[PDB]
């Protein structure tokens, strides 16, 4: 690259890993909404919600692949894990799930930041701060406040009263 | 003051004494707010109302602070007490507590009313009729009425559909 | 599923398989969209043109998947493999892969379209039909006529030329 | 908290003592206000522009309130000491005031940012950097070109004339 | 200066470094427009896009001096020094001058960065991030696209083409 | 240059000549700018109206450089000398400084023009009247009248009212 | 004529030779518009651009005949010498020979410029300089702008571009 000042090969390299790390969240957040629209599941607004979700995940990663080309490295993929589940139980334990893949999230954003610094890179740990820590723990807090609702409504009605007015 | 005029010493201090119960009060619909806040408790219409509730309370405070200058008066503030609590328990419990806040305004607003008519200060004791005593009748009715409603409702769901519900 | 009906274990199977085929081609796709976008390649129209594929193939996927739960079915996801390669050459050479996984693409379909018709299965074989042959076809032909035109304009100032003109 | 993750005990207390000094700094202002429109002092574009200063203060403490939630920390109030004088003196006197509170604010604001930065919080550092040290800065040569000119205007018909023209 | 705080001499000194570099920049820009705005030469988009750039180099300097002035820091300026050309040769010879310089004003804004940092200043090393280190990996981004589409065009109707459709 | 006609090359020079001396005026003009938005001399309108006054001396300069082109003179660059001063004194001063500045520029633009009349060049002499000279005697006639008026108003609050009066 | 002054018969002389030379070259650019109109030239925009400028070159004999009525001179006129060829070649060669006329047309007027200047004719050499002297560098510039260019693009596909790119 004519390009590529001050990008170190441990970040170029840590950026190809956080690029599969959103693609894997993304097709997660994918199975969850598909589970909420299952005939026998039916939470739409649960659904829609994960779906999008997945959607904010796949733009995570494809704003990782642009950085790493306006730096001059080069994208390099990997497979794409399949999530841990196919069926994700109840609203309260998806949402559980989700919290957890959140915060993982945010444990590997925080490790690349750190590389990041270790390299001097000013450009990169700018980047990682203005556009993934912050929606990253506004993301973390969603879920916890969602968690704690969940509990509070309880299964049955309450599920169906926070599918309903959770997301509108 | 050029301007002081039938306004006694002792309604100076009793104005003094308003503006420190208003802010006091105003703090604690500041913390009642952030408690509902919280990740854990995460009701945000009603952490919404309580924001709207300190609002009001440091324009009660302020409005006093204008009336002790228009009649000529000198503002003498004092430290504003941090709240009895830092958490507020149920949102019934939390509801209960504002209602007593607002009979202890009331109580306080009344005995200044007093103050100013045993110094024959029609002037003030009207103003505190039009600006703060009518609007104390209302907000303790509106406190008393949601404490009845939250009873009614009960913990869980319940909670949650009133938080949806009633401040919109 | 209580809405199960007419919908064999079979084809159940091949829908999934087909899931996974698209997910394939959407990551194929943004492989190509990033390689055209990188510093020292810089033809952002095709970037472009493969990242709005690359959304295409993932809509496809999640159209299966819609229709996998309408029929009670149940979605298992696989692993999305990798794409063959991370560098894809000149235009031209990215067009011919392109066009080969359209023409695989294809070929999955037929075979799933197949398998709906051997088990009398008339919604899916109708649903292929309507929302993935004809498209597939012209999607095929879309390549095809870029492949024929990206040869006549040849390498250098043609590769700018079809860039800027071939996407307006 | 479900959510706390990177957050030390010590950032959490910073935060809080913080917390306390923005809303000191929203008493201050109110004071100067309430001294500015008092019937003798009369400059009512100066009290108008404090109580602004007093609104901000606030918003700069109700932010920290909120983002110590977002991190999973617990807001812990403590009592609003009142500020130092009754009476600020002349206009060059009170924005002198106004602009060493300012600067206490600065240094109180560079010492929590770096208990941040001592426990590695990225998100935080971040968050204090763009919501406080920007603005902060922005305040302190506010005040300082204030003052520069209250100087240059001297006392009467310049204290006048800067009430009229320096708020428009 | 009344407002100066968490500010090293040897970091006033720097920004009046870099403000030096940013005009000079600027001055390079201008050289090159007026080129390719000869008789002979006559690229009147490369010429409406180099003098952009001047305009932008010019618009670094002065944000420079203005955080020069709301640090309270003193701004001292120095000679201008000529481009290092009078000519600049091919569009593509021009083009690659025009990385170097990016690439040279990149390394001394990270030094200006680090040398910041050295000293604490948190204020100076977000600004500089915010508003300098991602423009200046975006400019350097778009010179080596631009390189790579002056090498594929080639010398002749590719630089004619380049010209008509590359700022449109 | 094919175009080139009736352009002598004492004129080409005088030209080069002008660009520089333009240049320098625009970097007094930027100089005196951020000076008068210092923090302890903050008169934000006098440092408005010098950073236009750098702007439309840069546009001179341009302008100039632009001619040279049309009469396939070529463009020759020098450096640009800092400012005589890095503090301007006070507005009289400064005003008095930019005074002598015009004044200086009005001389070097007859020069020119006297230059271009010895060699029958009847394009660059009417260039220079309508482009040039008539805009210069405004200029001089502009700033001996803001210097009688900050003689008028005299130092202190007259100061004040000239920067918040003359340039609305 | 009664209107008659400071008008030499030697510039009227002079102003009837200009008008003859500007209908000379309207006559000029009319045959090259209709050489590039054929139907084995056909480059329209190059045709519709030698169009236009064999309406202006008539609009600047028509302009010549006013101003001579206005100093109360008289039209005389004489025969329009035809171009010196039928056809004009390639792009290249026509844009070469208008350049030619172009440069024969500013001596032309330079020459008339001097006549009106050596009778101390104020109002002519005015009139000269305003409304041809510029307009007539512009056009040569113009016309050397676009020789740069046809020798850039050279023949064939080059020249096909140059007519559908240079004049939109
Ligand atoms: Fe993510
Ligand atoms: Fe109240
Ligand atoms: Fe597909
Ligand atoms: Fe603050
Ligand atoms: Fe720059
Ligand atoms: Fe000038
Ligand atoms: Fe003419």
Same mark, same amino acid.
């Given at each position: +690259?004519?390009?590529? #000042?001050?990008?170190? +090969?441990?970040?170029?390299?840590?950026?190809?890993? #956080?690029?599969?790390?959103?693609?894997?969240?993304?097709?997660?957040?994918?199975?969850?909404?598909?589970?909420?629209?299952?005939?026998?599941?039916?939470?739409? &607004?649960?659904?829609?919600?994960?779906?999008?979700?997945?959607?904010?995940?796949?733009?995570?990663?494809?704003?990782?692949?642009? *950085? #790493?080309?306006?730096?001059?490295?080069? *994208? /390099?993929? #990997?497979?794409?894990?399949?999530?841990? &589940?196919?069926?994700?139980?109840?609203?309260?334990?998806?949402?559980?799930?989700?919290?957890?893949?959140?915060?993982? &999230?945010?444990?590997?954003?925080?490790?690349?930041? +750190?590389?990041?610094?270790?390299? &001097?890179?000013?450009?990169?740990?700018?980047?990682?701060?203005?556009?993934?820590?912050?929606?990253? /723990?506004? +993301?973390?807090?969603?879920?916890?406040?969602?968690?704690?609702?969940?509990?509070?409504?309880?299964?049955? *009605?309450?599920?169906? *009263?926070?599918?309903?007015?959770?997301?509108?």
């Amino acid at each position: +690259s004519l390009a590529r #000042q001050n990008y170190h +090969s441990e970040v170029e390299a840590a950026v190809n890993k #956080q690029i599969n790390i959103e693609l894997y969240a993304s097709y997660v957040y994918l199975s969850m909404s598909f589970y909420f629209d299952r005939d026998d599941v039916a939470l739409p &607004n649960i659904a829609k919600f994960f779906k999008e979700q997945s959607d904010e995940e796949r733009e995570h990663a494809t704003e990782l692949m642009r *950085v #790493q080309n306006l730096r001059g490295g080069r *994208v /390099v993929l #990997q497979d794409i894990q399949k999530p841990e &589940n196919d069926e994700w139980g109840t609203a309260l334990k998806a949402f559980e799930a989700a919290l957890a893949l959140e915060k993982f &999230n945010n444990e590997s954003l925080l490790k690349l930041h +750190s590389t990041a610094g270790n390299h &001097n890179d000013a450009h990169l740990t700018d980047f990682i701060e203005e556009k993934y820590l912050d929606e990253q /723990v506004k +993301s973390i807090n969603e879920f916890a406040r969602m968690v704690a609702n969940l509990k509070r409504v309880g299964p049955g *009605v309450g599920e169906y *009263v926070f599918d309903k007015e959770h997301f509108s």
